[PDB]
């Protein structure tokens, strides 16, 4: 099946009153406008996103739902950086460092911690840095990307 | 004359004591560690850094010191964008997307504002962020620069 349009988000209505199938993406798979997909039921499904989310494709966005049936995202845990900035500046530092690597930032809890995935170059240049940071099995979910607004 | 090392900077000292010749450079002449330059006063100076600031010369950084004679360098105002973040969040924002780009960029007073290099393309970034903004003219000093690794 083809979808163009998402259908809104698990979190705005009762997943108890639905039958649910989840379709397993990676965080890298959920700013893809075509792509194929398989779900847990073992549906087909391709998007083709007319207006595809600017962050990308969040945990439980409804890609079809018809009388009490839905399909829906779920992302896949992956391995990622945990960063804990311990000020502005370093704040500043490793938001500029990563994104001049052009490498995936997310916000964490608090405004000083960010989630990035593991790449040995970005490891190595918070090692450099000092920034205190641990790897983790962890969900980036898109909602809390940061965005790349005009990439060179 | 060549210069292989900095001699220290202006503010470790008292200048009025000294006779002050300085160097002017742009701010994105900074980094450069072989160079050929006149001063103000039209001195002939090389610089051939062996272990040059990493992130590049700093205003009143000393060429050259003998007697009460100091070579030091200026940076030249230029044309900035003046940014100031409203919140953490924000500066991180500003941080990763200025990266993106590659574009330069300095910390100011505040630990929310920053200055970048004016270009056409970080003003239209900044002015779609809807991040508070104006434009300048000020210096770029190197030891506010964030640099990359
Ligand atoms: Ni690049």
Not at 45 to 72: M, N, T, V, W, Y
Not at 104 to 129: D, H, V
Request: glycine share 4%.
């Amino acid at each position: 099946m083809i979808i163009e349009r998402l259908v809104g988000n698990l979190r705005d209505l009762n997943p108890l009153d639905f039958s649910v199938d989840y379709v397993d993406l990676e965080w890298f798979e959920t700013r893809k406008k075509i792509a194929r997909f398989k779900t847990r039921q073992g549906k087909d499904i391709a998007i083709r996103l007319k207006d595809a989310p600017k962050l990308g494709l969040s945990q439980g966005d409804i890609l079809f739902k018809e009388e009490k049936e839905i399909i829906a995202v779920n992302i896949l845990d992956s391995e990622v950086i945990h960063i804990q900035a311990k000020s502005v500046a370093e704040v500043a530092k490793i938001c500029y460092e990563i994104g001049n690597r052009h490498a995936a930032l997310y916000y964490g809890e608090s405004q000083f911690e960010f989630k990035t995935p593991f790449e040995k170059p970005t490891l190595a240049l918070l090692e450099k840095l000092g920034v205190q940071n641990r790897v983790l099995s962890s969900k980036l979910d898109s909602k809390e990307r940061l965005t790349v607004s005009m990439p060179h």
